[PDB]
Every structure is written in C-alpha cells, then in structure tokens.
Design a protein around this ligand. Structure first.
Ligand SMILES: [Mg+2]
Ligand SMILES: [Mg+2]
Ligand SMILES: [Mg+2]
Ligand SMILES: [Mg+2]
Ligand SMILES: [Mg+2]
Ligand SMILES: [Mg+2]
Ligand SMILES: [Mg+2]
Ligand SMILES: [Mg+2]
Ligand SMILES: [Mg+2]
Ligand SMILES: [Mg+2]
Ligand SMILES: [Mg+2]
Ligand SMILES: [Mg+2]
Ligand SMILES: [Mg+2]
Ligand SMILES: [Mg+2]
Ligand SMILES: [Mg+2]
Ligand SMILES: [Mg+2]
Ligand SMILES: [Mg+2]
Ligand SMILES: [Mg+2]
Ligand SMILES: [Mg+2]
Ligand SMILES: [Mg+2]
Ligand SMILES: [Mg+2]
Ligand SMILES: [Mg+2]
Ligand SMILES: [Mg+2]
Ligand SMILES: [Mg+2]
Ligand SMILES: [Mg+2]
Ligand SMILES: [Mg+2]
Ligand SMILES: [Mg+2]
Ligand SMILES: [Mg+2]
Ligand SMILES: [Mg+2]
Ligand SMILES: [Mg+2]
Ligand SMILES: [Mg+2]
Lengths: 102, 209, 202, 53
RNA sequence: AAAGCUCCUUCGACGAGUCGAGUAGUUUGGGAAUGCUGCUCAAAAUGGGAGGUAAAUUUCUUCUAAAGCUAAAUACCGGCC
RNA sequence: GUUGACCUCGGAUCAGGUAGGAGGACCCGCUGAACUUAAGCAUAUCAAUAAGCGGAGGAAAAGAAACCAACAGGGAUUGCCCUAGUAACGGCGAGUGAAGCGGCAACAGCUCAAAUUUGAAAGCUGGCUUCGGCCCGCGUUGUAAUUUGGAGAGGAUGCUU
C-alpha cells in the first residue's frame, strides 16, 4: 500500500479507489547489482592491464591542479556529462588508496 | 483551377495508383474456405473444445477505462493460488501469460474464481485405459453433455457496470462542504502551486535560522 | 574459467599490454592474401560467444576491406541530372563494411554456410574480420539438433539476403516507436500504405 | 584401454552382490585443462602449477 | 535411474571498437536533428536504454540491447490442373 | 649426434562428398533516373518508383519485448475494419502524411555464452566387421549431462509422476 488515491480525477493525487498490493520482486530487475565473483575478476585485470592514456592525463591533473578542468576534459572524451562525473569520481578513489596506503 | 464555391480538394492520386488496386471478389469464396478449416480442426480435436480459456482484463486508457474484455493468459501468481502446476496448465486447454502482474487485489480475486470453477467442470481421461490413476476420472461420470465453444460459455458476463440503481429517500448522501463544482477548482489549483508553495515554506525555515 | 578473464581483458583496448599485441598482429597480417584460411580463432572467447564449437565441420576464414567511403562511379564527374543529386565525393554506402567482408567469403566457400563474424583488427586503410562457417553436408553436423536447422534449403546464402546479425542492424529490425517505417520490412509497408482497397459493398 | 578393465571389474561385483566403490579405491591423478585448472586455484586446492611458455 | 509441487538464513555468473557523444551525406510525418552508413573520441554496475523541445540539479514509471530457432491467418494465374 | 614429437604451410587423376545454369508473376536486399506538377524555375514533386545487380520458397519475410503507455494499467509476430486525410512535415507554395488504444481472423512456444563430470570425454566423423564389436583419428585453446532471468543454484520436507 504505497499511496492512497483520492478518488476524484483532476487533482494532485487523482485516481480510482482500489486496493493496491505489494508483490515479490522479479529476477529480471537484478541487472545492475554487484557480485563477488565479478568484483574479484575486474580488480585483478585492472592490475594487469593498467591505465589508458586519457585516464593518465586526468589523474595527474586531478591532483595538484584544477577540478573544473578535470571535468571539461573528461566530458570531451567520454561525450556526456553523466559519465564524466562518474569517471572523475572513480579516478579520485585510486589516488586516495595509492598515496594514503604507503 | 477553382471556378465556384467549392471545398478545396485533396485527392492523393498522383502516384501510379493503378498498379496497386486490391479488389475483393473472393469474399464469399474465402468464407467457405474458413468454414471447411474450422470443422476439419474440430474433427481432429474430437472431445476437446476448440478454443482455450482466457482471463478477464480491463482496458488500459482513461477512455475505455470502464469496460472489460478477455486477455491473453493467466499470471503465474493466479495459477499458484488455484493450485495448478505451471507445466500442466497449457496442456489441458488453459492459456498462460508469463509477463503480466497483479498490481491490485480485485483483478487477482476475480480471475482465481473464474479459474477455480473450470477445474470442477473438467473431465480428464486417463493416459492408459487399463491402468487409471488417482487424478483421473473414475469412468462413472465420463458420460455427460459437453460444451465445445468455450468462448460463449466462458465469455464476459457483463462488460459495463449497471446503468442505474434505485435507493430509498433519506438515504441520499450529503455532498462536499463547498460543493461539487468548487471542489474541482480547488483540487486543480493545488497541483499547479505545489512547487511555488513548497520552496517559499522551505526558504522561510532557513531565513529565520 | 579462463574465458571470463579474456572478456575483461579484451575490453581494455588502450592498455599497454593489449595495444602492443594488436600492433604486432596487424603486421603479421597484410602480408598474407586478402582472403585466407585460419587454423584456429584468434579470439577464443568471442568466437565461443557466437556459436563456434571445436568439432569437425566448423571452419574460420578471415578477410580485409579497404576502409573508406563510397565514391559514385561515373564517367569523369558528370551525372546529367538536377543539381540536388550531382555530388560525387561525400556519399556513403548503406551497408556496413562487416557485411561486405562476409559476402566475399561466401563466394570463395560456396559449399558452406555463414554463422557470424567479428572484429579483429583495423588499420589506416583496412579493417580485419573473422568469419565462422559451418559445413551443411557433414554427418557430424546433421546429427546434432542444436545446429541442423541450418541444413534446410531456406537458409541458402543468407549472407546477401540480410539475415545475419549485422544484416539485421542495417535494416530497421527492432520494436518501438523509433523503428516505424522499417519494423516489418521497409518495402512491404510502403506497399501497404499505398494500396487502394475496394470492397463489394461500398 | 586401462579404463575398460576397471569398468568390466565393476560389472562382475555389482551382479555378485557387492555394490560399487567396494573393489576400487580413490584415484590420485594430475589435473589438466585450462578452465578446470583455473577453478582449482581460485579455491586454494592446488599446490603447484606448471605453465607452458 | 529420471521428473513435478510447497517453504527458507544465505548465494544468484547475464554478450565491447559494441552502447553513447561530436561531425559529414542520405532518408523519414520525426520538428536544437526518426532510421541508416563513413571518419574522430570511446563507457558503466542498481548499471544501462527509452519516456516525441536543447541544458543543470532532485525524484518517479517501465523494460533488459550489442548471439540463435519456430507452424497458422497474408501475397501471387508465372508453372501443372 | 642419432631418433621421435609439436606448430604453421604445401603436393597428388589420393578415399567420400558439395557449389555454378534455368525460372524470377509473388518475396529479402543493394543501386538509382528523367519526362511530368508547381501555369516560368533551382529546394520540393513524380519517387525512397522504372531500368541495372546479388540471393531463396510454396509461400517468403517478421516474431516470444532494452514494447505501448501515464491507466482501475495493457502483454510475441502478420493481415482486415477503424483511428485519419488526423498530430506533424512543406519557396508553410504546389503538395505530402504515420502511430498507441478499440472490434475481428488466426494462435504455440523455446536453446546457447557466462559454473570444476574432476571419484574417472561420461560425447563424435571414418574404416573393418559376423552383427559382438575392434582400430586409427577429431577433442582438454573444452565434445555430452546440468542452467537461460518466467528464473535458477545449494539446502530442507512428504506425497505423487
Ligand atoms: Mg580442424
Ligand atoms: Mg570504398
Ligand atoms: Mg541522371
Ligand atoms: Mg540533396
Ligand atoms: Mg528536385
Ligand atoms: Mg531482434
Ligand atoms: Mg459514398
Ligand atoms: Mg542480453
Ligand atoms: Mg554506432
Ligand atoms: Mg542512395
Ligand atoms: Mg540525419
Ligand atoms: Mg528468422
Ligand atoms: Mg579422387
Ligand atoms: Mg571435386
Ligand atoms: Mg543463380
Ligand atoms: Mg506520366
Ligand atoms: Mg513546370
Ligand atoms: Mg506548362
Ligand atoms: Mg521548361
Ligand atoms: Mg525525398
Ligand atoms: Mg526493377
Ligand atoms: Mg499459407
Ligand atoms: Mg521463415
Ligand atoms: Mg526473454
Ligand atoms: Mg505494464
Ligand atoms: Mg501485440
Ligand atoms: Mg525533408
Ligand atoms: Mg514521399
Ligand atoms: Mg488491436
Ligand atoms: Mg560409426
Ligand atoms: Mg532440472
């Protein structure tokens, strides 16, 4: 029972009165969840393969440098603002782990 | 070249329309073919009904929202409530749809009853005559009058709600305090100003702090 | 197993390990013929994902194409037409380079059937592909029901009829409001919208 | 060829009245196969790995 | 030997020079760009696509792409009747 | 050194097989005009059509959702009636122009990649055979069983098939 409908149309919460129910979650909706089997593989390959040239330019510019430039440059490569934000956040993690470890 | 008071014409007849004209002189000939195919199919399925069972479904748009009709198949939750295995359903004339869900409880309850009484009316012949099994018909009531359409015998009983109802006086309810017409105007303007009102209230809390 | 890691490694085509390995292979190629047999697939994980199996009757071929854009073939530059369609230089072909690679292989091996193809390498003037073929007359193929559907006489030369994976992309074979004019066949629907139907009792 | 003798040996016992795994013992062999080996080391069951060059 | 149903703490692998973006030509009723193709750049894990006006911030609905198969209702007098 | 394997590349009138041509009314793709209309004419229109080229069948193609929707929610594909000469496009000129819902015809659903059989490649082409099987080869850079999101795996539990 998420929300109760008012019972008259043309309103903030319009609808027809009915008894809504909660239903079991379908397996098709588990697409994006992380798995411990795929996190293990993706971590090992990153160690073997290394980084890419465009990441190496951002990661250097992200530390001791501008932050607006790190997002203007990231958007121009990846192509969209949403992906640029996530990539900058992810690269910020690796530098935090690197220097602060030892 | 218009000459008099005319309606401006728009006749899409500038391509080579004559190459694609589909006259229908085989309307009665085709009908005979279908009737020969139906009775041939009914002969192959000797004791079985021709059609398959369908559930009750409501139309999806605000217009046509009132009426109901037949659907494609029963949801996996409807079959479970009536105690029918998933794999056995398609093989005894029941149609199953695996991509439909039961958001409400009115639709779920209506279909379960519509499917439960069908199970009581079913006669199930054994796979081998000499060795019957527990779920088979015990051969005593195998002889009875049967139906074959299953679309007229199991169609929608009534698609629309009753036209009117008659109730005694002094049972008539009282309307909304403001009135019916003004209740709509207030509800309309409340949704228009939901954003303006919300930020003004919120910024006041931060302004005083 | 190991095939999962190969999927992850092949995703990073800009890393130093992969980039070196692509540069050396592309030189090994381009010294052989344009079309030639391959002993075994060079991308075992990618081929496996598309239906390849390691049993008799399955073969792999590879081919390269010129990697450009179509130039209208006319005597000199004259077209003898209205100005709206007298351009010669910036026109484009309506089928992918992947499709042309599959089609030339089909003429070379006229007794086999094409299953799929995938990208292997590319250059400044070439793009390389590997094509999976199946023998429809082998006994080991007709015995297995997961693949013997291809032996039917309706799957003949489906390379140039537009029935492989890349053929379905070049056509608008998808559902939705976006693929309206080509959902069931572009030319079929144009006939439907342009026919004039008359019944007996008008 | 060795597998044939063991399989025939099992048939005589199962007809005689002795069930399987009563005439044979647990085998100890070297493992092989890329996918098979990769799984073994992920579970820390392997003790030594040899790789071709 | 093999198969079906009812319950659960926990697990639950899912397709890459692809999706997407910029630019060029063609095409569509598709209009700050509907589909297709060439070149340059090139992804992610509750992620990703779509929600018919370009953009940022915050919510919501709905499906699961980049591998494959399959009868009937439909077209046609060219071939044999 | 001798000798025996492995990988890649070849010879043969080697053993056994397979493709071309015709037809092309209907069907799946590529390529691609101008006459004509606008009372001239260049974007537009004729037209995503004629000619040219490649590939199939008795039907072909399509198809079990990265869909439609905004509802009290519909539920693979194809065709007919309606939506509709409508939303929209257009020297906004001449002209062009779909889709969802709704009634009916016909109805049917499925297997692969990504998991170690690991207490036993359990799988297959070919040759010989008295018909019971044997021999070489393919294959561990993965052939059967098991799983396909509707789930499923691993555990519980008593009946049934
Ligand atoms: Mg081989
Ligand atoms: Mg070219
Ligand atoms: Mg010309
Ligand atoms: Mg033009
Ligand atoms: Mg013109
Ligand atoms: Mg598809
Ligand atoms: Mg009239
Ligand atoms: Mg997928
Ligand atoms: Mg693309
Ligand atoms: Mg063109
Ligand atoms: Mg465009
Ligand atoms: Mg098909
Ligand atoms: Mg010979
Ligand atoms: Mg020969
Ligand atoms: Mg021919
Ligand atoms: Mg004319
Ligand atoms: Mg004129
Ligand atoms: Mg004139
Ligand atoms: Mg003139
Ligand atoms: Mg045009
Ligand atoms: Mg023609
Ligand atoms: Mg037919
Ligand atoms: Mg077909
Ligand atoms: Mg599915
Ligand atoms: Mg829905
Ligand atoms: Mg439908
Ligand atoms: Mg236009
Ligand atoms: Mg037109
Ligand atoms: Mg309909
Ligand atoms: Mg044999
Ligand atoms: Mg099972």
């Amino acid at each position: 029972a998420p929300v109760e409908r008012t019972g008259l149309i043309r309103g903030l919460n319009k609808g027809h009165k009915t008894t809504r129910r909660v239903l079991k979650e379908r397996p098709s909706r588990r697409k994006g969840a992380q798995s411990k089997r795929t996190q293990f593989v993706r971590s090992l390959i990153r160690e073997v393969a290394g980084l890419a040239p465009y990441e190496r330019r951002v990661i250097e510019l992200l530390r001791n440098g501008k932050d607006k430039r790190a997002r203007k440059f990231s958007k121009k490569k990846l192509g969209t603002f949403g992906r640029a934000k996530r990539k900058c956040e992810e690269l910020q993690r690796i530098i935090a782990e690197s220097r602060r470890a030892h | 070249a218009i000459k008099h008071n005319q309606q401006i014409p728009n006749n899409h007849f500038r391509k080579h329309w004559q190459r694609r004209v589909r006259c229908h002189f085989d309307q009665p000939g085709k009908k005979v073919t279908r009737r020969l195919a139906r009775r041939a199919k009914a002969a192959a399925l000797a004791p079985r009904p021709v059609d398959k069972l369908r559930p009750i479904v409501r139309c999806p748009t605000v217009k046509y929202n009132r009426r109901t009709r037949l659907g494609r198949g029963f949801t996996l939750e409807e079959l479970k409530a009536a105690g029918i295995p998933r794999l056995l359903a398609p093989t005894i004339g029941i149609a199953v749809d695996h991509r439909r869900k039961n958001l409400s409880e009115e639709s779920l309850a209506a279909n379960v009853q519509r499917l439960k009484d069908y199970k009581a009316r079913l006669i199930l012949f054994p796979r081998k005559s000499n060795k019957p099994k527990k779920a088979d018909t015990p051969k005593d009531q195998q002889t009875a009058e049967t139906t074959t359409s299953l679309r007229t015998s199991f169609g929608v009983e009534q698609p629309l709600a009753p036209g009117f109802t008659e109730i005694s006086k002094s049972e008539i309810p009282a309307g909304i305090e403001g009135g019916a017409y003004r209740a709509l105007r207030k509800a309309r303007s409340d949704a228009r100003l939901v954003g303006v009102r919300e930020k003004r209230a919120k910024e006041k809390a931060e302004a005083e702090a | 197993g190991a095939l999962k890691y190969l999927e992850e490694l092949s995703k990073k085509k800009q890393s130093d390990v992969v980039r070196f390995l692509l540069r050396v292979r592309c030189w090994e190629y381009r010294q052989l013929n344009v079309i030639h047999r391959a002993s075994r697939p060079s991308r075992p994980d990618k081929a496996r994902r598309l239906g390849y199996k390691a049993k008799q009757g399955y073969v792999i071929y590879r081919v390269r194409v010129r990697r450009g854009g179509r130039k209208r073939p006319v005597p000199k530059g004259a077209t003898y037409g209205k100005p709206t369609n007298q351009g010669v230089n910036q026109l484009k072909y309506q089928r992918s380079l992947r499709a042309t690679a599959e089609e030339r292989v089909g003429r070379r091996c006229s007794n086999l059937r094409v299953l799929n193809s995938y990208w292997v390498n590319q250059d400044s003037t070439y793009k390389y592909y590997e094509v999976i073929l199946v023998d429809p007359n082998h006994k080991a193929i007709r015995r297995d029901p997961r693949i013997n559907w291809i032996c039917n006489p309706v799957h003949k030369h489906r390379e140039c009829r537009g029935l492989t994976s890349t053929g379905k992309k070049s056509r608008g074979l998808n559902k939705g409001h976006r693929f309206n004019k080509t959902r069931a066949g572009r030319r079929k629907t144009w006939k439907r919208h342009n026919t004039l139907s008359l019944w007996r009792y008008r | 060829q060795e597998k044939k003798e063991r399989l025939l040996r099992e048939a005589t016992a199962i007809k005689e009245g002795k069930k399987k795994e009563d005439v044979s013992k647990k085998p100890y062999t070297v493992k092989y196969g890329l996918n098979h080996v990769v799984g073994l080391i992920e579970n820390k069951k392997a003790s030594l790995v040899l790789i071709a060059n």
